[PDB]
Amino acid sequence: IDLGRVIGELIDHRKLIISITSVFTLFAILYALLATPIYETDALIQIEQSAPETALLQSRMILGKTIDDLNLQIQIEQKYFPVIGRGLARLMGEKPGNIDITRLYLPDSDDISNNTPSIILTVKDKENYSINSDGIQLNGVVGTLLNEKGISLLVNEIDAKPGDQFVITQLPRLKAISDLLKSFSVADLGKDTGMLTLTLTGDNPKRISHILDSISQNYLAQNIARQAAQDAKSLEFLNQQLPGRAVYLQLLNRQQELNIAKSSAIGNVRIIDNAVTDPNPVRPKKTIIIVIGVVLGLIVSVVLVLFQVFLRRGIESPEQLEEIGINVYASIPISEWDTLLAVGNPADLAVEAIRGLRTSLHFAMMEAKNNVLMISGASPSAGMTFISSNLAATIAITGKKVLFIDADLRKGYAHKMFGHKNDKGLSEFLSGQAAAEMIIDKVEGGGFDYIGRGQIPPNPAELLMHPRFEQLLNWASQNYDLIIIDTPPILAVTDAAIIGRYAGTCLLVARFEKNTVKEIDVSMKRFEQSGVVVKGCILNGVVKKASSYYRYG
Amino acid sequence: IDLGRVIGELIDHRKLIISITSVFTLFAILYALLATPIYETDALIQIEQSAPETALLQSRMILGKTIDDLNLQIQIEQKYFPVIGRGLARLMGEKPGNIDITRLYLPDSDDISNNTPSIILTVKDKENYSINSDGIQLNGVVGTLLNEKGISLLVNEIDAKPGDQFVITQLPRLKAISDLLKSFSVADLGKDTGMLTLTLTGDNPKRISHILDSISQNYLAQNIARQAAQDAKSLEFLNQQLPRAVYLQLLNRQQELNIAKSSAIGNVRIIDNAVTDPNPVRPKKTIIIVIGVVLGLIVSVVLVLFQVFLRRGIESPEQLEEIGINVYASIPISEWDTLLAVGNPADLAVEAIRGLRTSLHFAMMEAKNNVLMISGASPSAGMTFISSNLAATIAITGKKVLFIDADLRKGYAHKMFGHKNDKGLSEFLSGQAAAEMIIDKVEGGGFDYIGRGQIPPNPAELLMHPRFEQLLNWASQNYDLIIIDTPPILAVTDAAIIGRYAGTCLLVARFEKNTVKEIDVSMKRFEQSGVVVKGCILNGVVKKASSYYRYG
């Protein structure tokens, strides 16, 4: 988990980490290139406070007058069936479609849920067009207003590209307020200065400048209207109260004072400069999400790789087994590769390591009480028969006579791999229905005598206790230089602990990443309980990255 | 309790955790889907302070005038017998019912507790209807008012759906003010700006906009009736004081006060009349559902950890080996009246018993005799299961096995192997039977079996009798193995009496039932009695924790 280990596993998993980081950056870049650009326009309003004005601008009288001025409750979008059709259309350089509807009146379904009757325009040419509400397509021409089925459309200046689809939505006036008010924004930047910087953000650049100018003009007009409206209510009741006659003349003097004031009462709000749209979109923020894509890919990659590190629990190196006090006799690397590897590809790495095992056993197998070696995998799929068979081959070619007993009576398949006469296997001998001679075979490849399990017997462990088995071993250890026995795991059945009574040397075979140290520890302790002293293990299937062996020649 | 152990038990208990988290999330879904929506409407009120205004709008003078204006003390609900009938009615798309009562006068029961006389409207059609107060159903039609039994009711524009029930409550004016006031709210957002955000929240969307509009109008008229009242008091005194140049000056002031009074532009303007946000603000969807998820998750965690800190039994042979107990086996639970070792010989729980046979055969050599005693740490430790199957799995090997069931209190081996209940073990110790008529032969396992026989009155006094050692000495010569079942030592002392003659003694501990304390005390009490317990035999270990697996 150290920095060195970190970089090691990173370069080892460089494919995964770069793949995930690159794919998230691909999502980021496609999103940055497909998200519609959003321009921002600004204006400067000057007054002589400004705290009421930042709230009166965003009031519904102001926005509500712009909406009715520009008909912004008539919403128009070019149709693109995919969620990214519009973005790719912009990327291709296609000029976006746009039309002007000066007067819209839907059939006004205006239901509780679907209060936005949605219609689609099919552009037929630059002059005529067709409108489908729910299938009923009404063909129409710009100029002439379409008044059918309670549906009133006055659409003019339709765009060029025909065949397009334009979704029209007569969303409610309150909605046409709320969206704008969401986009609209005000500030002061002087905390007392009359300057207000209105900002409106939107997609259609030319539209937002007009909308902001409309807001500014409405604000100008309404402030002119208010100061005058004070005097206007005064004037209204003066007009209502005119009938004493000298007082009538005094009221006429006040009337003439008030009347002109209304026309002349223009002030207190100022458009220092009308709205213009900044050509550079402010959103989507390029180079701010792509770096977020990079960092998101990096963080998720590390949080996944660390999770996988804390996932696996199998053996990782012989040092783990030697920590418990287990003499790992070999580390057989996994070979890329029906005949024996030790005779098919005699110079493979996995066979060089088995020769390295042969020498170490040859040293460790003298002083053993007899020349019978028992090899029991830690579990199925630990390769016990692979290692035992190749070891038998590599010891046969040396020149010693080897007998390879496959005492895995439960699911042993060595006879399925050496070529066999399935009759008269091992089990058929223990049952007493076969003699010691008709069971041995000759693997022509390895050159070592082979004894197969034969038929699966109903009672394996009961058979192995029969005293004929020790007779077999006593005879063979006199007629052979080495005897290798295959036995089932000790975590599953007790066959291994029965055969181990007669074996001089016993070894476990542990698959590299499959079997855990717990399985080896429990297996060795369970062998000891049964009076069988496990000599050591033979780590197997170690990946070539962690295997010390390499080609030499 | 470690992260690995945490996730292991979570996946093991994945059914429980997902079940409870899912059902609380379902409760959250149904609540969020049935909780009646509440809309809020907004209006904007300007002044040129606003600190008095935020408390004068909420005064009873203003609210109580809207109440009397819109008849808000006349409360109406569509009736739904369940607590969720209204919600599901909305779910089904059914348009909610509503009527209009322009004039309600109940009998005015107005008791101390039931100061809110409640009646129910039964909609008969679009024109007529019936009202039951306490059973007395009065039929009436819109238009004509029902004035009977002191009940003056004028309902018009009754809804369409007939047969419905409408609960009508003439709640007192103070309550009809207080509810509006708890829903009502004010703010300023400028701290000196005249801008006030009136906000009112209700369920009926169209109603609350009208309510807030009426509040605004009442407030506006009240502001007129303060300032126009100042000018009107001045003008009223002029009108009362008018009795010639001074008269013309007073007439000038008269018309000036006329215009100043009647103009009376309020310091307040309604910026924009109240409108209702179509999106309900409560119930807050996706804010309680996530709270439902986190609540289910936290309660699942706190319950699973509690159950973790609930069980005290053995959890693995390592716990026994820590104390210094040689766990000779771990027999897993078998799914499965004949012996398992002859019924289903390939069962995992029998493979483990063969594994025990081999370890005993090694560990039982050098023992002073071939007698094995197996005593469970408690009843329901499966002692007889293990001993019987072990005797079977040793019998098929070919050794002659004698199986003595010395559980003279509640032994039931004869109830399992098929029996001649006469002449059991007790009938031998009592001296009324000889050693030969007590022995049987289980045809299945193939081992000679000695039943306890009749429950004696004094078990322990019998077992001390010297005939028992005669039996064992004779058997150990005529049999290759002798297995003795004995009662738990924590309950009676028979086990420590038989153990004097047993070469090997083993305890059987159920996996999660028996604790480490029971095993430790059992071995200490065996030691005090001069019986050296060889080791334990963990029993009934669950397949999740056992290393055994099928092979073949």
Residue numbers in the entry:
A (entry chain C): 17 to 64, 85 to 279, 384 to 477, 494 to 709
B (entry chain B): 17 to 64, 85 to 279, 385 to 477, 494 to 709
What does the paper say about this structure?
Gram-negative species couple polymerization with translocation across the periplasm and outer membrane and the master regulator of the system is the tyrosine autokinase, Wzc. The tyrosine autokinase domain forms the cytoplasm region, while the periplasmic region contains small folded motifs and helical bundles. Autophosphorylation of the tyrosine-rich C-terminus of Wzc results in disassembly of the octamer into multiply phosphorylated monomers. We propose that the cycling between phosphorylated monomer and dephosphorylated octamer regulates glycan polymerization and translocation.
A 2.8 Å-resolution structure of the WzcK540M4YE octamer was determined using the same approach as WzcK540M. Overall, this structure has similar octameric (rmsd 3.1 Å over 4520 Cα atoms) and monomeric (rmsd of 2.5 Å over 651 Cα atoms) arrangements seen in WzcK540M. The core kinase domain is unchanged between the structures (rmsd 0.4 Å for Cα atoms 452–697) but the tyrosine-rich tail has undergone a large change that now places Y708 at the active site (compared Y717 in WzcK540M). Motif 3 still possesses the same three structural arrangements seen in WzcK540M but only two (not three) monomers have the fully ordered class i arrangement (rmsd of 0.4 Å for 133 Cα atoms). The larger rmsd value for the monomer and octamer, compare to the individual regions, reflects shifts in the relative positions of the regions. This can be visualised by superimposing the core kinase domains of monomer for WzcK540M and WzcK540M4YE, which shows a rigid body rotation of 11° at the other end of the molecule. Superposition using all the Cα atoms in octamer reveals shifts in the periplasmic helices, particularly those in class ii. Comparing WzcK540M vs WzcK540M4YE revealed the distribution of arrangements changed, suggesting the helical bundles are particularly sensitive to changes elsewhere in the structure. The structure of WzcK540M4YE, chosen to mimic a phosphorylated state, showed a significant conformational change in the tyrosine tail, which would be predicted to weaken the octamer.
